[PDB]
Amino acid sequence: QKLSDTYEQLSRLLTTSAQAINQAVNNLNERAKTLAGGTTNSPAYQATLLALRSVLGLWNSMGYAVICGGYTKSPGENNQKDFHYTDENGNGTTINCGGTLKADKNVSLSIEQYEKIHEAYQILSKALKQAGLAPLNSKGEKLEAHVTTSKYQQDNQTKTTTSVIDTTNDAQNLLTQAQTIVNTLKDYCPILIAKNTPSWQTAGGGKNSCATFGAEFSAASDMINNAQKIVQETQQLSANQPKNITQPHNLNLNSPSSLTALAQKMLKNAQSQAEILKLANQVESDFNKLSSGHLKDYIGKCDQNQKNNWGNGCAGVEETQSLLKTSAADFNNQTPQINQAQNLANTLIQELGNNPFRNM
Numbered sequence: 001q002k003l004s005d006t007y008e009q010l011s012r013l014l015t016t017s018a019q020a021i022n023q024a025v026n027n028l029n030e031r032a033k034t035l036a037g038g039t040t041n042s043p044a045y046q047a048t049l050l051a052l053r054s055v056l057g058l059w060n061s062m063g064y065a066v067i068c069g070g071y072t073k074s075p076g077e078n079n080q081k082d083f084h085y086t087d088e089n090g091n092g093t094t095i096n097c098g099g100t101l102k103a104d105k106n107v108s109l110s111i112e113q114y115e116k117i118h119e120a121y122q123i124l125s126k127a128l129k130q131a132g133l134a135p136l137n138s139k140g141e142k143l144e145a146h147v148t149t150s151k152y153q154q155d156n157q158t159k160t161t162t163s164v165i166d167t168t169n170d171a172q173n174l175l176t177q178a179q180t181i182v183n184t185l186k187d188y189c190p191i192l193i194a195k196n197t198p199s200w201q202t203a204g205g206g207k208n209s210c211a212t213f214g215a216e217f218s219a220a221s222d223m224i225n226n227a228q229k230i231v232q233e234t235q236q237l238s239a240n241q242p243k244n245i246t247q248p249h250n251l252n253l254n255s256p257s258s259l260t261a262l263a264q265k266m267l268k269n270a271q272s273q274a275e276i277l278k279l280a281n282q283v284e285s286d287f288n289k290l291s292s293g294h295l296k297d298y299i300g301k302c303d304q305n306q307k308n309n310w311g312n313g314c315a316g317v318e319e320t321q322s323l324l325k326t327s328a329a330d331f332n333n334q335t336p337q338i339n340q341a342q343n344l345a346n347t348l349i350q351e352l353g354n355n356p357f358r359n360m
Helices: 005-013 018-037 043-062 111-131 171-188 214-238 256-290 317-333 335-351
Strands: 081-086 092-097 142-152 158-168
Touching: 005 256, 005 335, 018 043, 018 214, 018 256, 018 335, 043 111, 043 171, 043 214, 043 256, 043 317, 081 111, 111 142, 111 158, 111 171, 171 214, 214 256, 256 317, 256 335, 317 335
Parallel strands: none
Antiparallel strands: 081 092, 081 142, 142 158
8 A cells, every 4th residue: 555655756766766776876886986996997097197108208209409507597607417317227318407598488497497307207207117107096106216417516526416206106296297397398498409300309499499399388288287187086086976775665764865865976976977088088189289290200109228219209108098099988888877877866856856755
């Protein structure tokens, strides 16, 4: 017999049955868990890694050509400083700065700015090449990054500096390093050295980087910015899990109010995922912008560590872009699962919003 109108309607909405709802709740949560804590199969993580690898690759491709060592000093006085782009054991090459011109906007970079690019870059490179980038919902491993330089100050005086940096591969930290690099180039647009000489250096060449690379810089800054967002969205997504319906016979636990609140978490969770996937796509769209102009023939090409690979990207960007592509399409295939979850949630909210659940 009938016990209540409230009850009779609730048991109609749980047989949109309880099974239907639980299967949508599971899709949502397996899809979120892939998205936020996976690697190979997460577009959020592959876009994030892509943006980091892209900066690494931008620097390798065109970094050697930037003018560093201008005078802040006001004369010029002594800025003779060499930066060792090496591994832990000294395998790699060195860049000379201060070998002059006023370091300021549009002419040259100061040693102070170059030391920050070099440091950033070496944390990036070591994190990205040994530890990997950690899943977007992990604290991250600890890594040690070495950062070595040589300065020639008085005559017959050599300062050889090794900084050991205890840091982590969490995405937030790596995006901060990458932002330092992109921002220094974008904001201070140092002149390119003139001089097989990459196309961009020849039409280059004594003008400020930024006339050559203005688009490539904008593209890599935006990849970074949108990656920071994917990372926020992703961790705030982790903190919005709809719970499976347990004991669907029990209409006290599964009250109108409890089901309304679950549908709302179901909708918030899916909006998060849409938004992550939209951002990850725009990161792709921007990489393309970054890799389709001056740097097309170089960024993400590679020709052990003892080798000089300046000029070409040697950063991993193609391998990563293709995993982004794969995984962005796998999430796109699941776009029904997410429409079912939403239609369901919207039905529970509509049904539980008229008689006999409120006075009308």
